[PDB]
Amino acid sequence: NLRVLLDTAIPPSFCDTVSSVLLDDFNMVSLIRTSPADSLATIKQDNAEIDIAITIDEELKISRFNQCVLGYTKAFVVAHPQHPLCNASLHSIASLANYRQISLGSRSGQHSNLLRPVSDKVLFVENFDDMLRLVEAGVGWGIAPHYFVEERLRNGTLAVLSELYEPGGIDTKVYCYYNTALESERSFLRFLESARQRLRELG
Amino acid sequence: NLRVLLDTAIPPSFCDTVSSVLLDDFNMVSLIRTSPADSLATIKQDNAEIDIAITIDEELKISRFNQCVLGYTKAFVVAHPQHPLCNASLHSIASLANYRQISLGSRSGQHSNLLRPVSDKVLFVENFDDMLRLVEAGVGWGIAPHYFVEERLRNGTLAVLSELYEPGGIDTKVYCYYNTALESERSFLRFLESARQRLRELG
Numbered sequence: 001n002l003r004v005l006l007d008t009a010i011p012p013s014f015c016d017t018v019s020s021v022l023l024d025d026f027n028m029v030s031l032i033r034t035s036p037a038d039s040l041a042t043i044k045q046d047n048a049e050i051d052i053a054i055t056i057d058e059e060l061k062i063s064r065f066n067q068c069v070l071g072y073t074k075a076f077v078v079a080h081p082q083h084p085l086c087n088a089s090l091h092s093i094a095s096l097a098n099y100r101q102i103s104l105g106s107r108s109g110q111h112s113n114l115l116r117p118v119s120d121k122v123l124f125v126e127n128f129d130d131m132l133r134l135v136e137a138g139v140g141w142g143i144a145p146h147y148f149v150e151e152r153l154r155n156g157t158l159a160v161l162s163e164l165y166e167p168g169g170i171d172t173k174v175y176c177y178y179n180t181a182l183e184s185e186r187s188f189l190r191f192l193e194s195a196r197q198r199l200r201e202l203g
Numbered sequence: 204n205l206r207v208l209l210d211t212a213i214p215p216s217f218c219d220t221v222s223s224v225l226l227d228d229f230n231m232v233s234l235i236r237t238s239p240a241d242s243l244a245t246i247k248q249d250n251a252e253i254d255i256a257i258t259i260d261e262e263l264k265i266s267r268f269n270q271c272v273l274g275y276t277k278a279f280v281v282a283h284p285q286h287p288l289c290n291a292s293l294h295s296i297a298s299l300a301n302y303r304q305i306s307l308g309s310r311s312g313q314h315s316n317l318l319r320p321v322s323d324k325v326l327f328v329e330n331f332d333d334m335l336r337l338v339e340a341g342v343g344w345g346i347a348p349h350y351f352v353e354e355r356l357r358n359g360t361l362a363v364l365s366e367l368y369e370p371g372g373i374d375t376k377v378y379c380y381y382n383t384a385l386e387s388e389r390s391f392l393r394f395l396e397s398a399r400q401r402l403r404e405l406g
């Protein structure tokens with residue numbers, strides 16, 4: 001039995017590749033969705049017995065676990081098109097720390113440097129659906145994955161703020177935290193190259 | 204008079220692009236090399252009167268300054284080809300925390316999460332030249348820029364350890380920390396697009 005954790009931030013394409021590739025070697029394979037804010041929090045509970053975690057969140061070294069880079073995914077800072085910062089000027093990028101941010105909440109109450117909110121006006125949510133509902137209502141701005149907002153951006157229901165910060169959207173390493181045990185086992189090495197080599201063909 | 208700080212980690216190609224593009228708008232332009240470990244440390248000294256810093260190092264928010272992404276550069280974990288971890292196995296990646304690392308030193312004694320050493324056996328240096336001299340002598344392993352080790356890798360004087368962690372080498376955002384003042388001035392906006400658009404054509 002293999003237990004795999006996936007961030008809600010991890011595109012559903014990546015999830016399709018991971019899941020497929022594992023069934024070639026593994027007989028029981030349990031997939032588990034988690035807020036990016038609860039990913040590492042979860043694997044560090046020993047009882048939760050997670051073997052692999054695919055998450056965007058970064059923490060240097062963890063008990064029992066090793067890190068590596070599966071690939072890259074995009075993220076945009078999004079607001080209601082009528083949002084004051086809609087012009088997305090270079091002063092507006094500094095003024096994001098002034099305006100209400102709709103940030104992801106941590107069950108642990110604690111955030112990493114990456115996922116910690118930037119502004120003092122913060123309204124926490126559990127998932128990106130809740131985030132974008134509030135952002136569509138112009139209640140604030142938020143940082144969400146590409147696949148979650150591709151739909152709404154073309155439909156014009158949402159606008160981007162991030163282009164002057166990082167043109168093309170904010171590149172984000174998808175990390176693979178694997179139980180130290182698996183490093184020797186070639187079952188995992190197959191999965192890693194295979195998943196990487198497929199995720200590379202998406203890119 | 205414009206004062207620009209550049210990391211020793213910033214490729215000399217990037218430096219050629221930055222410097223060129225600035226002279227199109229600016230009449231005095233002072234270029235200043237710094238260890239990645241001393242980049243942010245420097246700009247936060249108010250007397251140093253830095254206007255722009257191009258560095259790989261990351262710190263969320265700084266007094267007087269705004270952040271943005273100029274582009275991406277590569278970095279490899281390198282050792283003497285005869286180094287015990289030469290096989291670069293997945294257990295060897297975990298065992299880097301056991302072996303002597305030749306890390307960059309901070310004049311402030313403090314490191315960011317990014318540039319803080321990983322192993323307990325650490326031998327600090329001021330620059331990548333010192334790092335790679337010691338690494339060629341097999342004294343330890345180190346993390347250095349692509350352009351610094353491209354020469355030695357082909358010549359076989361050095362070996363790579365990083366490929367299982369991140370195939371292709373370790374992607375690293377080149378940040379542009381600019382004095383908040385410049386956000387309005389179109390002189391800077393020209394430079395940013397121009398530098399990005401040229402650094403993109405290198406990629």
Ligand SMILES: CCCCCc1nc(Cn2cnc3ccc(Cl)cc3c2=O)cs1
Binds near residue numbers: 118170171
């Ligand atoms: C100028 C506005 C951008 C600064 C603020 C940033 N935030 C980050 C970290 N961050 C956070 N939330 C995410 C959610 C989803 C995804 Cl896919 C990525 C991320 C992410 O990178 C970087 S850059």
Ligand SMILES: CCCCCc1nc(Cn2cnc3ccc(Cl)cc3c2=O)cs1
Binds near residue numbers: 317347373
């Ligand atoms: C498995 C070995 C890799 C883990 C250890 C890492 N270290 C980092 C931060 N880091 C540090 N030193 C640099 C020097 C030069 C350049 Cl161009 C980049 C960097 C860098 O990213 C990431 S990954």
